[PDB]
């Protein structure tokens, strides 16, 4: 029979192979192998872990189903604050924002444009490549420690390929179809439906039973880090590419605009494409691309002066 010695080694092989397939399937939204290939290897791993429960590790794909049930969430401080964003609602506000930026910097500036995802803001801390803390934004300086729930979100890596220590921030949301499916299930069980995917994601992440959260099919998009110390990026667009390179799911609709006019074109392009996406967006976020310039602009008490969120009506 398969010995513990042989299983210990085989278990790691399976975790690596299965995690790579999951990265392709959930993070790149582009699987390489047919589902049956993954399922077969997954079953082999489950059999090994069942025979030797000591070989179960936090980065094993079998742990995505959750199991822990908490009494409540511990406070999760953000020593590096999670700021909000100033809002814009008209072409005027956007060009005015550009005027203020040029006034302060003294030259034209490039802008990294991204879609504003309507979900729950999250901060993911990794130490030596290992996922150690998942937290909600809360009030900006203190959120809720929802690490166990986030372990079930399939697109969240449990172990990065490189043992880097960083804290990434983004949005955890519920895709349109998943939101539709969930409300139908609630109607079937006589429960109150969620008013929108935003509330569905928030309500899901507030669940104390991780097994329930694991079935809610939440997804993620990461767009920044709390401390750029371990990162090599010097611009926001570079940061998005680097986040992708280290293993996080990033939104593919971002664009680097060299002028405010290009920025407005972007806003118009995605405004008309708004309902064609598998997820809901409440606008567009415009950020001064160069970190050196973001630094020069600084932050107000509530948000950075180097970014503005154009909110859809």
Ligand X SMILES: NC(=O)c1ccc[n+]([C@@H]2O[C@H](COP(=O)(O)O)[C@@H](O)[C@H]2O)c1
Residue among 13, 29, 39, 162 that touches ligand X (CB under 6 A): 39
Closest distance between ligand X and the C-beta of residue 36, in Å?
A: 7
Q: Which of residues 104-163 bind ligand X (CB under 6 A)?
A: 154
Closest distance between ligand X and the C-beta of residue 219, in Å?
A: 12
Mark whether 116 is an active-site residue. yes
Burial class (CB within 10 angstroms; exposed 0-12, middle 13-18, buried 19+) of 296: middle
Closest distance between ligand X and the C-beta of residue 247, in Å?
A: 15
How big is the site for ligand X, counted in residues (CB under 6 A)? Answer: 13
Residue among 11, 14, 15, 38 that touches ligand X (CB under 6 A): 38
In sequence order, what are the beta bridge partners of 133? 125
On whether 301 is known to bind a ligand per the annotation, the reply is no
Q: Binding to ligand X by residue 209, rule CB under 6 A?
A: no
Closest distance between ligand X and the C-beta of residue 15, in Å?
A: 12
Residue among 10, 12, 17, 25 that touches ligand X (CB under 6 A): 25
Residue among 10, 12, 17, 31 that touches ligand X (CB under 6 A): 31
Q: Binding to ligand X by residue 178, rule CB under 6 A?
A: no
On whether 295 is known to bind a ligand per the annotation, the reply is no
Q: Binding to ligand X by residue 46, rule CB under 6 A?
A: no
Q: Binding to ligand X by residue 295, rule CB under 6 A?
A: no
Structure tokens at 11: 């278990």
Q: For ligand X, which is the closer residue by CB, 158 or 281?
A: 158
On whether 118 is known to bind a ligand per the annotation, the reply is no
Closest distance between ligand X and the C-beta of residue 158, in Å?
A: 12
Question: C-alpha angle 155/159/165, rounded to 5°?
Answer: 110
- The alpha carbon of residue 224 and the mean position of all alpha carbons in its chain are separated, in whole angstroms, by 10
Q: For ligand X, which is the closer residue by CB, 36 or 189?
A: 36
On whether 137 is known to bind a ligand per the annotation, the reply is yes
Asked if residue 99 lies in contact with residue 85, where contact means CB atoms within 8 angstroms, the answer is: no
Cα–Cα dist 223/241, whole Å? 9
Cα–Cα dist 308/312, whole Å? 13
Closest distance between ligand X and the C-beta of residue 161, in Å?
A: 17
- Catalytic residue, chosen from 75, 116, 234, 273, is 116
Q: Binding to ligand X by residue 61, rule CB under 6 A?
A: yes
On whether 234 is known to bind a ligand per the annotation, the reply is no
Q: For ligand X, which is the closer residue by CB, 42 or 194?
A: 42
Q: For ligand X, which is the closer residue by CB, 31 or 175?
A: 31
On whether 287 is known to bind a ligand per the annotation, the reply is yes
Residues 6+ apart with CB under 8 A from 11: 45, 48, 49, 52, 55, 57, 60
Q: Binding to ligand X by residue 310, rule CB under 6 A?
A: no
Cite the annotated binding site for NAD(+) by residue number. 35-39, 84-87, 114, 137, 171, 287, 311
The catalytic residues are: 116
Binding residues for ligand X (CB under 6 A):
21-22, 24-25, 31, 33, 35, 38-39, 42, 61, 64, 154
């Amino acid at each position: 029979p398969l010995t513990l010695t042989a299983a210990t080694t085989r278990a790691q092989e399976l975790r690596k192979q299965l995690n790579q397939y999951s990265h392709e399937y959930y993070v790149k939204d582009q699987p390489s192998v047919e589902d049956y290939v993954y399922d077969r290897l997954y079953k082999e791993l489950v059999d090994i872990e069942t025979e030797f429960p000591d070989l179960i590790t936090p980065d094993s794909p079998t742990q995505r189903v959750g199991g822990k049930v908490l009494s409540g969430f511990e406070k999760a401080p953000h020593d590096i604050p999670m700021y909000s964003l100033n809002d814009g609602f008209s072409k005027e506000d956007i060009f005015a924002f550009d005027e203020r930026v040029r006034k302060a910097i003294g030259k034209p500036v490039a802008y990294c444009c991204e879609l504003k995802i309507d979900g729950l803001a999250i901060s993911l801390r990794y130490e030596n490549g290992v996922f150690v803390r998942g937290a909600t934004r809360g009030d900006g300086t203190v959120g809720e420690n929802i690490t166990e729930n986030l372990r079930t979100v399939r697109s969240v890596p449990m172990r990065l390929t490189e043992p880097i220590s960083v804290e990434v921030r983004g949005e955890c949301y519920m895709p349109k179809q998943s939101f539709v499916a969930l409300n139908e299930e609630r109607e079937e069980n006589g429960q109150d439906i969620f008013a929108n995917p935003r509330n569905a994601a928030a309500g899901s992440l507030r669940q104390l039973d991780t097994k329930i959260v694991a079935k809610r099919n939440l997804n993620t998009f990461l767009y920044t880090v709390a401390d750029f110390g371990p990162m090599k990026a010097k611009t926001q667009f570079e940061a998005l590419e680097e986040l992708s390179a280290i293993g996080f799911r990033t939104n593919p609709e971002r664009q680097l605009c060299q002028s405010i006019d290009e920025v407005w074109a972007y806003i118009e392009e995605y405004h008309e494409k708004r309902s064609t996406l598998p997820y809901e967006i409440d606008g567009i976020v415009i950020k001064v691309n160069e970190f050196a310039l973001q630094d020069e602009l600084g932050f107000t008490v509530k948000a950075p002066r180097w970014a503005i969120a154009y909110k859809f009506p």
